[PDB]
Amino acid sequence: LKVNQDGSRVLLRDVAKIELGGENYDIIAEFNGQPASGLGIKLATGANAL
Amino acid sequence: QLLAEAAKHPDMLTSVRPNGLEDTPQFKIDIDQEKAQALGVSINDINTTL
């Protein structure tokens, strides 16, 4: 991010916690108390469900 | 590996081959940001020039 006047290095891990996480934590899912996920699938007009 | 194991069954297969290109040499330019900042160079200007 910058080099201080004292010749030091200001990395990103020194001012921020970096990790992998969902783009949004709004939605969560559980299957019988068990952590899970899934897809909700709809139909396009005119198609057959089967 | 699959092409190798396929050349071992010439009684059923032949002329087996890929339909693509094989890897070629590539020139990698590793930039260092410490010096680019020390000398006061904008990585944006660097890559735009390049």
PDB file of all heavy atoms in Angstrom, chain A residues 8-49:
ATOM      1  N   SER A   8      10.183   1.153   5.494  1.00  0.00           N
ATOM      2  CA  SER A   8       9.432  -0.046   5.828  1.00  0.00           C
ATOM      3  C   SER A   8       8.346  -0.302   4.790  1.00  0.00           C
ATOM      4  O   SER A   8       7.989   0.578   4.002  1.00  0.00           O
ATOM      5  CB  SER A   8       8.804   0.086   7.214  1.00  0.00           C
ATOM      6  OG  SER A   8       7.731   1.011   7.199  1.00  0.00           O
ATOM      7  N   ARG A   9       7.818  -1.521   4.803  1.00  0.00           N
ATOM      8  CA  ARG A   9       6.786  -1.927   3.864  1.00  0.00           C
ATOM      9  C   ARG A   9       5.455  -2.085   4.584  1.00  0.00           C
ATOM     10  O   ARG A   9       5.368  -2.753   5.618  1.00  0.00           O
ATOM     11  CB  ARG A   9       7.166  -3.240   3.180  1.00  0.00           C
ATOM     12  CG  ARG A   9       8.020  -3.066   1.937  1.00  0.00           C
ATOM     13  CD  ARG A   9       8.466  -4.408   1.371  1.00  0.00           C
ATOM     14  NE  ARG A   9       9.155  -5.234   2.361  1.00  0.00           N
ATOM     15  CZ  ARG A   9      10.323  -4.931   2.920  1.00  0.00           C
ATOM     16  NH1 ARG A   9      10.964  -3.819   2.585  1.00  0.00           N
ATOM     17  NH2 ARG A   9      10.861  -5.749   3.814  1.00  0.00           N
ATOM     18  N   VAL A  10       4.422  -1.459   4.032  1.00  0.00           N
ATOM     19  CA  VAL A  10       3.068  -1.548   4.572  1.00  0.00           C
ATOM     20  C   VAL A  10       2.297  -2.482   3.647  1.00  0.00           C
ATOM     21  O   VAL A  10       1.718  -2.069   2.640  1.00  0.00           O
ATOM     22  CB  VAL A  10       2.411  -0.176   4.692  1.00  0.00           C
ATOM     23  CG1 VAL A  10       0.950  -0.322   5.066  1.00  0.00           C
ATOM     24  CG2 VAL A  10       3.137   0.663   5.720  1.00  0.00           C
ATOM     25  N   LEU A  11       2.278  -3.761   4.003  1.00  0.00           N
ATOM     26  CA  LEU A  11       1.530  -4.744   3.241  1.00  0.00           C
ATOM     27  C   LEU A  11       0.038  -4.600   3.514  1.00  0.00           C
ATOM     28  O   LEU A  11      -0.400  -3.703   4.239  1.00  0.00           O
ATOM     29  CB  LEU A  11       1.989  -6.157   3.595  1.00  0.00           C
ATOM     30  CG  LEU A  11       3.482  -6.437   3.435  1.00  0.00           C
ATOM     31  CD1 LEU A  11       3.835  -7.789   4.012  1.00  0.00           C
ATOM     32  CD2 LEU A  11       3.884  -6.361   1.979  1.00  0.00           C
ATOM     33  N   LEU A  12      -0.744  -5.503   2.921  1.00  0.00           N
ATOM     34  CA  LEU A  12      -2.190  -5.456   3.108  1.00  0.00           C
ATOM     35  C   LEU A  12      -2.617  -6.319   4.286  1.00  0.00           C
ATOM     36  O   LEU A  12      -3.546  -5.965   5.019  1.00  0.00           O
ATOM     37  CB  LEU A  12      -2.896  -5.903   1.830  1.00  0.00           C
ATOM     38  CG  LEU A  12      -4.419  -5.805   1.840  1.00  0.00           C
ATOM     39  CD1 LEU A  12      -4.861  -4.367   1.729  1.00  0.00           C
ATOM     40  CD2 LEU A  12      -4.998  -6.619   0.707  1.00  0.00           C
ATOM     41  N   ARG A  13      -1.949  -7.456   4.484  1.00  0.00           N
ATOM     42  CA  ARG A  13      -2.256  -8.321   5.613  1.00  0.00           C
ATOM     43  C   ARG A  13      -1.995  -7.653   6.954  1.00  0.00           C
ATOM     44  O   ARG A  13      -2.438  -8.172   7.983  1.00  0.00           O
ATOM     45  CB  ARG A  13      -1.438  -9.607   5.519  1.00  0.00           C
ATOM     46  CG  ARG A  13       0.059  -9.384   5.521  1.00  0.00           C
ATOM     47  CD  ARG A  13       0.815 -10.695   5.520  1.00  0.00           C
ATOM     48  NE  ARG A  13       2.253 -10.489   5.687  1.00  0.00           N
ATOM     49  CZ  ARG A  13       3.185 -10.834   4.803  1.00  0.00           C
ATOM     50  NH1 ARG A  13       2.863 -11.410   3.653  1.00  0.00           N
ATOM     51  NH2 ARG A  13       4.460 -10.595   5.072  1.00  0.00           N
ATOM     52  N   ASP A  14      -1.286  -6.527   6.967  1.00  0.00           N
ATOM     53  CA  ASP A  14      -0.965  -5.820   8.196  1.00  0.00           C
ATOM     54  C   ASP A  14      -2.081  -4.895   8.659  1.00  0.00           C
ATOM     55  O   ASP A  14      -2.065  -4.464   9.817  1.00  0.00           O
ATOM     56  CB  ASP A  14       0.318  -5.008   8.007  1.00  0.00           C
ATOM     57  CG  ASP A  14       1.528  -5.882   7.756  1.00  0.00           C
ATOM     58  OD1 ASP A  14       1.382  -7.122   7.792  1.00  0.00           O
ATOM     59  OD2 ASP A  14       2.623  -5.330   7.517  1.00  0.00           O
ATOM     60  N   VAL A  15      -3.039  -4.579   7.791  1.00  0.00           N
ATOM     61  CA  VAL A  15      -4.148  -3.699   8.143  1.00  0.00           C
ATOM     62  C   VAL A  15      -5.502  -4.285   7.784  1.00  0.00           C
ATOM     63  O   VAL A  15      -6.518  -3.590   7.939  1.00  0.00           O
ATOM     64  CB  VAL A  15      -3.993  -2.312   7.483  1.00  0.00           C
ATOM     65  CG1 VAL A  15      -2.606  -1.762   7.733  1.00  0.00           C
ATOM     66  CG2 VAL A  15      -4.279  -2.394   6.001  1.00  0.00           C
ATOM     67  N   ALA A  16      -5.562  -5.526   7.309  1.00  0.00           N
ATOM     68  CA  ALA A  16      -6.811  -6.124   6.872  1.00  0.00           C
ATOM     69  C   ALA A  16      -6.729  -7.634   7.008  1.00  0.00           C
ATOM     70  O   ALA A  16      -5.687  -8.247   6.764  1.00  0.00           O
ATOM     71  CB  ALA A  16      -7.137  -5.746   5.424  1.00  0.00           C
ATOM     72  N   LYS A  17      -7.848  -8.228   7.407  1.00  0.00           N
ATOM     73  CA  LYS A  17      -7.987  -9.676   7.468  1.00  0.00           C
ATOM     74  C   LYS A  17      -8.523 -10.177   6.135  1.00  0.00           C
ATOM     75  O   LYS A  17      -9.613  -9.784   5.710  1.00  0.00           O
ATOM     76  CB  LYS A  17      -8.920 -10.092   8.605  1.00  0.00           C
ATOM     77  CG  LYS A  17      -8.387  -9.761   9.986  1.00  0.00           C
ATOM     78  CD  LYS A  17      -9.364 -10.167  11.077  1.00  0.00           C
ATOM     79  CE  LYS A  17      -8.812  -9.854  12.457  1.00  0.00           C
ATOM     80  NZ  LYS A  17      -9.767 -10.225  13.533  1.00  0.00           N
ATOM     81  N   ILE A  18      -7.757 -11.043   5.484  1.00  0.00           N
ATOM     82  CA  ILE A  18      -8.077 -11.548   4.156  1.00  0.00           C
ATOM     83  C   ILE A  18      -8.519 -12.992   4.300  1.00  0.00           C
ATOM     84  O   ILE A  18      -7.856 -13.780   4.985  1.00  0.00           O
ATOM     85  CB  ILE A  18      -6.871 -11.444   3.209  1.00  0.00           C
ATOM     86  CG1 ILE A  18      -6.393  -9.999   3.103  1.00  0.00           C
ATOM     87  CG2 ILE A  18      -7.223 -11.976   1.834  1.00  0.00           C
ATOM     88  CD1 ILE A  18      -4.914  -9.876   2.924  1.00  0.00           C
ATOM     89  N   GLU A  19      -9.631 -13.344   3.660  1.00  0.00           N
ATOM     90  CA  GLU A  19     -10.045 -14.736   3.662  1.00  0.00           C
ATOM     91  C   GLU A  19     -11.007 -14.975   2.513  1.00  0.00           C
ATOM     92  O   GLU A  19     -11.242 -14.098   1.682  1.00  0.00           O
ATOM     93  CB  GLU A  19     -10.684 -15.129   4.999  1.00  0.00           C
ATOM     94  CG  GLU A  19     -11.958 -14.383   5.324  1.00  0.00           C
ATOM     95  CD  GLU A  19     -12.303 -14.428   6.798  1.00  0.00           C
ATOM     96  OE1 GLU A  19     -11.374 -14.511   7.629  1.00  0.00           O
ATOM     97  OE2 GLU A  19     -13.505 -14.382   7.129  1.00  0.00           O
ATOM     98  N   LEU A  20     -11.534 -16.192   2.460  1.00  0.00           N
ATOM     99  CA  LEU A  20     -12.540 -16.530   1.468  1.00  0.00           C
ATOM    100  C   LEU A  20     -13.905 -16.593   2.135  1.00  0.00           C
ATOM    101  O   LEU A  20     -14.077 -17.264   3.157  1.00  0.00           O
ATOM    102  CB  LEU A  20     -12.205 -17.865   0.812  1.00  0.00           C
ATOM    103  CG  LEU A  20     -11.128 -17.821  -0.269  1.00  0.00           C
ATOM    104  CD1 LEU A  20     -10.501 -19.183  -0.437  1.00  0.00           C
ATOM    105  CD2 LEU A  20     -11.706 -17.347  -1.583  1.00  0.00           C
ATOM    106  N   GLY A  21     -14.880 -15.894   1.560  1.00  0.00           N
ATOM    107  CA  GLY A  21     -16.194 -15.836   2.163  1.00  0.00           C
ATOM    108  C   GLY A  21     -17.246 -15.539   1.120  1.00  0.00           C
ATOM    109  O   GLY A  21     -16.946 -15.084   0.019  1.00  0.00           O
ATOM    110  N   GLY A  22     -18.494 -15.806   1.483  1.00  0.00           N
ATOM    111  CA  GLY A  22     -19.571 -15.641   0.531  1.00  0.00           C
ATOM    112  C   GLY A  22     -19.700 -14.204   0.069  1.00  0.00           C
ATOM    113  O   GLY A  22     -19.385 -13.260   0.794  1.00  0.00           O
ATOM    114  N   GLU A  23     -20.168 -14.043  -1.168  1.00  0.00           N
ATOM    115  CA  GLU A  23     -20.457 -12.707  -1.674  1.00  0.00           C
ATOM    116  C   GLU A  23     -21.564 -12.050  -0.862  1.00  0.00           C
ATOM    117  O   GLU A  23     -21.700 -10.822  -0.860  1.00  0.00           O
ATOM    118  CB  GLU A  23     -20.843 -12.780  -3.149  1.00  0.00           C
ATOM    119  CG  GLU A  23     -19.747 -13.318  -4.036  1.00  0.00           C
ATOM    120  CD  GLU A  23     -20.216 -13.606  -5.447  1.00  0.00           C
ATOM    121  OE1 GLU A  23     -21.410 -13.384  -5.737  1.00  0.00           O
ATOM    122  OE2 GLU A  23     -19.389 -14.059  -6.266  1.00  0.00           O
ATOM    123  N   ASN A  24     -22.358 -12.855  -0.164  1.00  0.00           N
ATOM    124  CA  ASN A  24     -23.426 -12.366   0.688  1.00  0.00           C
ATOM    125  C   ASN A  24     -23.757 -13.438   1.714  1.00  0.00           C
ATOM    126  O   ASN A  24     -23.998 -14.599   1.376  1.00  0.00           O
ATOM    127  CB  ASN A  24     -24.675 -12.003  -0.121  1.00  0.00           C
ATOM    128  CG  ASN A  24     -25.217 -13.176  -0.909  1.00  0.00           C
ATOM    129  OD1 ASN A  24     -24.459 -13.941  -1.503  1.00  0.00           O
ATOM    130  ND2 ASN A  24     -26.533 -13.329  -0.912  1.00  0.00           N
ATOM    131  N   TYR A  25     -23.761 -13.033   2.981  1.00  0.00           N
ATOM    132  CA  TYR A  25     -24.124 -13.915   4.078  1.00  0.00           C
ATOM    133  C   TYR A  25     -25.594 -13.807   4.451  1.00  0.00           C
ATOM    134  O   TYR A  25     -25.993 -14.326   5.498  1.00  0.00           O
ATOM    135  CB  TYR A  25     -23.266 -13.612   5.310  1.00  0.00           C
ATOM    136  CG  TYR A  25     -21.780 -13.776   5.097  1.00  0.00           C
ATOM    137  CD1 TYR A  25     -21.068 -12.872   4.328  1.00  0.00           C
ATOM    138  CD2 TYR A  25     -21.088 -14.826   5.678  1.00  0.00           C
ATOM    139  CE1 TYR A  25     -19.714 -13.014   4.138  1.00  0.00           C
ATOM    140  CE2 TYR A  25     -19.734 -14.974   5.491  1.00  0.00           C
ATOM    141  CZ  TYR A  25     -19.053 -14.066   4.721  1.00  0.00           C
ATOM    142  OH  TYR A  25     -17.699 -14.213   4.535  1.00  0.00           O
ATOM    143  N   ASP A  26     -26.408 -13.144   3.628  1.00  0.00           N
ATOM    144  CA  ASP A  26     -27.820 -12.990   3.946  1.00  0.00           C
ATOM    145  C   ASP A  26     -28.533 -14.332   4.026  1.00  0.00           C
ATOM    146  O   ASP A  26     -29.218 -14.609   5.017  1.00  0.00           O
ATOM    147  CB  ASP A  26     -28.498 -12.102   2.905  1.00  0.00           C
ATOM    148  CG  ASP A  26     -28.053 -10.654   2.991  1.00  0.00           C
ATOM    149  OD1 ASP A  26     -27.693 -10.203   4.099  1.00  0.00           O
ATOM    150  OD2 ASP A  26     -28.067  -9.964   1.949  1.00  0.00           O
ATOM    151  N   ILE A  27     -28.391 -15.169   3.004  1.00  0.00           N
ATOM    152  CA  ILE A  27     -29.110 -16.432   2.903  1.00  0.00           C
ATOM    153  C   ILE A  27     -28.281 -17.521   3.564  1.00  0.00           C
ATOM    154  O   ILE A  27     -27.053 -17.556   3.416  1.00  0.00           O
ATOM    155  CB  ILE A  27     -29.415 -16.792   1.439  1.00  0.00           C
ATOM    156  CG1 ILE A  27     -30.205 -15.671   0.771  1.00  0.00           C
ATOM    157  CG2 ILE A  27     -30.213 -18.076   1.371  1.00  0.00           C
ATOM    158  CD1 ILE A  27     -30.465 -15.900  -0.694  1.00  0.00           C
ATOM    159  N   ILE A  28     -28.956 -18.410   4.285  1.00  0.00           N
ATOM    160  CA  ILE A  28     -28.350 -19.583   4.898  1.00  0.00           C
ATOM    161  C   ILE A  28     -29.348 -20.722   4.775  1.00  0.00           C
ATOM    162  O   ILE A  28     -30.555 -20.485   4.676  1.00  0.00           O
ATOM    163  CB  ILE A  28     -27.976 -19.339   6.374  1.00  0.00           C
ATOM    164  CG1 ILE A  28     -27.040 -18.139   6.497  1.00  0.00           C
ATOM    165  CG2 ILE A  28     -27.328 -20.573   6.967  1.00  0.00           C
ATOM    166  CD1 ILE A  28     -26.742 -17.742   7.919  1.00  0.00           C
ATOM    167  N   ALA A  29     -28.853 -21.954   4.779  1.00  0.00           N
ATOM    168  CA  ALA A  29     -29.696 -23.120   4.571  1.00  0.00           C
ATOM    169  C   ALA A  29     -29.322 -24.220   5.548  1.00  0.00           C
ATOM    170  O   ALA A  29     -28.157 -24.360   5.929  1.00  0.00           O
ATOM    171  CB  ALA A  29     -29.576 -23.636   3.141  1.00  0.00           C
ATOM    172  N   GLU A  30     -30.323 -24.998   5.951  1.00  0.00           N
ATOM    173  CA  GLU A  30     -30.114 -26.147   6.814  1.00  0.00           C
ATOM    174  C   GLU A  30     -31.064 -27.259   6.403  1.00  0.00           C
ATOM    175  O   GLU A  30     -32.206 -27.004   6.012  1.00  0.00           O
ATOM    176  CB  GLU A  30     -30.320 -25.798   8.292  1.00  0.00           C
ATOM    177  CG  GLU A  30     -29.220 -24.937   8.881  1.00  0.00           C
ATOM    178  CD  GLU A  30     -29.397 -24.705  10.365  1.00  0.00           C
ATOM    179  OE1 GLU A  30     -30.458 -25.085  10.903  1.00  0.00           O
ATOM    180  OE2 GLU A  30     -28.473 -24.147  10.995  1.00  0.00           O
ATOM    181  N   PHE A  31     -30.576 -28.492   6.487  1.00  0.00           N
ATOM    182  CA  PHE A  31     -31.330 -29.680   6.117  1.00  0.00           C
ATOM    183  C   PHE A  31     -31.430 -30.588   7.333  1.00  0.00           C
ATOM    184  O   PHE A  31     -30.530 -31.396   7.583  1.00  0.00           O
ATOM    185  CB  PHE A  31     -30.658 -30.405   4.955  1.00  0.00           C
ATOM    186  CG  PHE A  31     -31.439 -31.570   4.435  1.00  0.00           C
ATOM    187  CD1 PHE A  31     -32.646 -31.378   3.798  1.00  0.00           C
ATOM    188  CD2 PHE A  31     -30.962 -32.858   4.577  1.00  0.00           C
ATOM    189  CE1 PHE A  31     -33.362 -32.443   3.316  1.00  0.00           C
ATOM    190  CE2 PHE A  31     -31.677 -33.929   4.097  1.00  0.00           C
ATOM    191  CZ  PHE A  31     -32.879 -33.720   3.465  1.00  0.00           C
ATOM    192  N   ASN A  32     -32.519 -30.448   8.087  1.00  0.00           N
ATOM    193  CA  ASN A  32     -32.732 -31.237   9.298  1.00  0.00           C
ATOM    194  C   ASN A  32     -31.647 -30.948  10.328  1.00  0.00           C
ATOM    195  O   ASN A  32     -31.012 -31.856  10.870  1.00  0.00           O
ATOM    196  CB  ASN A  32     -32.792 -32.729   8.973  1.00  0.00           C
ATOM    197  CG  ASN A  32     -33.937 -33.078   8.051  1.00  0.00           C
ATOM    198  OD1 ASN A  32     -34.861 -32.290   7.860  1.00  0.00           O
ATOM    199  ND2 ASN A  32     -33.882 -34.268   7.470  1.00  0.00           N
ATOM    200  N   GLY A  33     -31.433 -29.665  10.602  1.00  0.00           N
ATOM    201  CA  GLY A  33     -30.388 -29.245  11.510  1.00  0.00           C
ATOM    202  C   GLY A  33     -28.983 -29.431  10.987  1.00  0.00           C
ATOM    203  O   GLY A  33     -28.026 -29.114  11.702  1.00  0.00           O
ATOM    204  N   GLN A  34     -28.829 -29.930   9.763  1.00  0.00           N
ATOM    205  CA  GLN A  34     -27.538 -30.209   9.164  1.00  0.00           C
ATOM    206  C   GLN A  34     -27.132 -29.086   8.216  1.00  0.00           C
ATOM    207  O   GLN A  34     -27.922 -28.699   7.348  1.00  0.00           O
ATOM    208  CB  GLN A  34     -27.580 -31.531   8.388  1.00  0.00           C
ATOM    209  CG  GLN A  34     -26.224 -32.120   8.077  1.00  0.00           C
ATOM    210  CD  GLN A  34     -26.320 -33.527   7.524  1.00  0.00           C
ATOM    211  OE1 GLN A  34     -27.411 -34.088   7.417  1.00  0.00           O
ATOM    212  NE2 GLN A  34     -25.179 -34.104   7.169  1.00  0.00           N
ATOM    213  N   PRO A  35     -25.922 -28.532   8.358  1.00  0.00           N
ATOM    214  CA  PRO A  35     -25.453 -27.544   7.378  1.00  0.00           C
ATOM    215  C   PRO A  35     -25.595 -28.040   5.952  1.00  0.00           C
ATOM    216  O   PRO A  35     -25.310 -29.206   5.665  1.00  0.00           O
ATOM    217  CB  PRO A  35     -23.984 -27.349   7.761  1.00  0.00           C
ATOM    218  CG  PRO A  35     -23.956 -27.586   9.216  1.00  0.00           C
ATOM    219  CD  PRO A  35     -24.999 -28.639   9.501  1.00  0.00           C
ATOM    220  N   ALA A  36     -26.031 -27.167   5.048  1.00  0.00           N
ATOM    221  CA  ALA A  36     -26.300 -27.578   3.683  1.00  0.00           C
ATOM    222  C   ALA A  36     -26.397 -26.354   2.792  1.00  0.00           C
ATOM    223  O   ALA A  36     -26.306 -25.212   3.249  1.00  0.00           O
ATOM    224  CB  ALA A  36     -27.594 -28.382   3.590  1.00  0.00           C
ATOM    225  N   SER A  37     -26.592 -26.612   1.503  1.00  0.00           N
ATOM    226  CA  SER A  37     -26.925 -25.567   0.546  1.00  0.00           C
ATOM    227  C   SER A  37     -27.858 -26.175  -0.487  1.00  0.00           C
ATOM    228  O   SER A  37     -28.314 -27.311  -0.341  1.00  0.00           O
ATOM    229  CB  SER A  37     -25.666 -24.977  -0.094  1.00  0.00           C
ATOM    230  OG  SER A  37     -25.239 -25.766  -1.185  1.00  0.00           O
ATOM    231  N   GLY A  38     -28.134 -25.438  -1.552  1.00  0.00           N
ATOM    232  CA  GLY A  38     -28.971 -25.990  -2.594  1.00  0.00           C
ATOM    233  C   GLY A  38     -29.396 -24.951  -3.601  1.00  0.00           C
ATOM    234  O   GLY A  38     -29.135 -23.753  -3.462  1.00  0.00           O
ATOM    235  N   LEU A  39     -30.069 -25.454  -4.629  1.00  0.00           N
ATOM    236  CA  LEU A  39     -30.550 -24.667  -5.753  1.00  0.00           C
ATOM    237  C   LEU A  39     -32.066 -24.745  -5.818  1.00  0.00           C
ATOM    238  O   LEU A  39     -32.636 -25.840  -5.790  1.00  0.00           O
ATOM    239  CB  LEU A  39     -29.957 -25.172  -7.067  1.00  0.00           C
ATOM    240  CG  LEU A  39     -28.440 -25.118  -7.205  1.00  0.00           C
ATOM    241  CD1 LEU A  39     -27.951 -26.290  -8.025  1.00  0.00           C
ATOM    242  CD2 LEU A  39     -28.029 -23.815  -7.842  1.00  0.00           C
ATOM    243  N   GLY A  40     -32.711 -23.588  -5.903  1.00  0.00           N
ATOM    244  CA  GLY A  40     -34.129 -23.520  -6.175  1.00  0.00           C
ATOM    245  C   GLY A  40     -34.376 -23.285  -7.647  1.00  0.00           C
ATOM    246  O   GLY A  40     -33.993 -22.243  -8.188  1.00  0.00           O
ATOM    247  N   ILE A  41     -35.006 -24.253  -8.304  1.00  0.00           N
ATOM    248  CA  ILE A  41     -35.154 -24.271  -9.751  1.00  0.00           C
ATOM    249  C   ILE A  41     -36.611 -24.006 -10.099  1.00  0.00           C
ATOM    250  O   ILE A  41     -37.517 -24.653  -9.556  1.00  0.00           O
ATOM    251  CB  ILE A  41     -34.682 -25.609 -10.339  1.00  0.00           C
ATOM    252  CG1 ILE A  41     -33.167 -25.738 -10.201  1.00  0.00           C
ATOM    253  CG2 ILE A  41     -35.083 -25.709 -11.786  1.00  0.00           C
ATOM    254  CD1 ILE A  41     -32.701 -27.140  -9.937  1.00  0.00           C
ATOM    255  N   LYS A  42     -36.823 -23.049 -10.997  1.00  0.00           N
ATOM    256  CA  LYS A  42     -38.130 -22.679 -11.512  1.00  0.00           C
ATOM    257  C   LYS A  42     -38.264 -23.145 -12.959  1.00  0.00           C
ATOM    258  O   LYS A  42     -37.416 -23.863 -13.492  1.00  0.00           O
ATOM    259  CB  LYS A  42     -38.328 -21.170 -11.397  1.00  0.00           C
ATOM    260  CG  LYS A  42     -38.232 -20.654  -9.984  1.00  0.00           C
ATOM    261  CD  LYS A  42     -38.288 -19.148  -9.930  1.00  0.00           C
ATOM    262  CE  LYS A  42     -38.347 -18.661  -8.501  1.00  0.00           C
ATOM    263  NZ  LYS A  42     -38.681 -17.220  -8.422  1.00  0.00           N
ATOM    264  N   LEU A  43     -39.351 -22.726 -13.602  1.00  0.00           N
ATOM    265  CA  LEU A  43     -39.633 -23.068 -14.988  1.00  0.00           C
ATOM    266  C   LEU A  43     -39.676 -21.827 -15.862  1.00  0.00           C
ATOM    267  O   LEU A  43     -40.136 -20.766 -15.432  1.00  0.00           O
ATOM    268  CB  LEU A  43     -40.969 -23.793 -15.134  1.00  0.00           C
ATOM    269  CG  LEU A  43     -41.102 -25.206 -14.616  1.00  0.00           C
ATOM    270  CD1 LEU A  43     -42.548 -25.630 -14.717  1.00  0.00           C
ATOM    271  CD2 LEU A  43     -40.204 -26.110 -15.429  1.00  0.00           C
ATOM    272  N   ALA A  44     -39.214 -21.982 -17.098  1.00  0.00           N
ATOM    273  CA  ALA A  44     -39.420 -20.962 -18.112  1.00  0.00           C
ATOM    274  C   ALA A  44     -40.774 -21.161 -18.776  1.00  0.00           C
ATOM    275  O   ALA A  44     -41.210 -22.291 -19.010  1.00  0.00           O
ATOM    276  CB  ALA A  44     -38.307 -21.020 -19.150  1.00  0.00           C
ATOM    277  N   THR A  45     -41.442 -20.052 -19.079  1.00  0.00           N
ATOM    278  CA  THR A  45     -42.780 -20.112 -19.651  1.00  0.00           C
ATOM    279  C   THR A  45     -42.795 -21.003 -20.886  1.00  0.00           C
ATOM    280  O   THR A  45     -41.972 -20.839 -21.791  1.00  0.00           O
ATOM    281  CB  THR A  45     -43.260 -18.707 -20.004  1.00  0.00           C
ATOM    282  OG1 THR A  45     -42.302 -18.075 -20.859  1.00  0.00           O
ATOM    283  CG2 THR A  45     -43.445 -17.872 -18.749  1.00  0.00           C
ATOM    284  N   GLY A  46     -43.735 -21.948 -20.920  1.00  0.00           N
ATOM    285  CA  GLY A  46     -43.912 -22.814 -22.061  1.00  0.00           C
ATOM    286  C   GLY A  46     -43.223 -24.156 -21.961  1.00  0.00           C
ATOM    287  O   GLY A  46     -43.418 -25.000 -22.845  1.00  0.00           O
ATOM    288  N   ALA A  47     -42.427 -24.383 -20.922  1.00  0.00           N
ATOM    289  CA  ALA A  47     -41.691 -25.634 -20.807  1.00  0.00           C
ATOM    290  C   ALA A  47     -42.480 -26.650 -19.993  1.00  0.00           C
ATOM    291  O   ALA A  47     -43.483 -26.321 -19.357  1.00  0.00           O
ATOM    292  CB  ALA A  47     -40.334 -25.393 -20.156  1.00  0.00           C
ATOM    293  N   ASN A  48     -42.011 -27.895 -20.018  1.00  0.00           N
ATOM    294  CA  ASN A  48     -42.646 -28.963 -19.263  1.00  0.00           C
ATOM    295  C   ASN A  48     -41.839 -29.269 -18.010  1.00  0.00           C
ATOM    296  O   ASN A  48     -40.608 -29.344 -18.049  1.00  0.00           O
ATOM    297  CB  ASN A  48     -42.777 -30.217 -20.124  1.00  0.00           C
ATOM    298  CG  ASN A  48     -43.688 -31.254 -19.507  1.00  0.00           C
ATOM    299  OD1 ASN A  48     -44.605 -30.923 -18.758  1.00  0.00           O
ATOM    300  ND2 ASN A  48     -43.440 -32.517 -19.820  1.00  0.00           N
ATOM    301  N   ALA A  49     -42.544 -29.438 -16.892  1.00  0.00           N
ATOM    302  CA  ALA A  49     -41.875 -29.677 -15.619  1.00  0.00           C
ATOM    303  C   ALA A  49     -41.159 -31.022 -15.612  1.00  0.00           C
ATOM    304  O   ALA A  49     -40.049 -31.146 -15.082  1.00  0.00           O
ATOM    305  CB  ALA A  49     -42.890 -29.605 -14.482  1.00  0.00           C
TER     306      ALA A  49
END
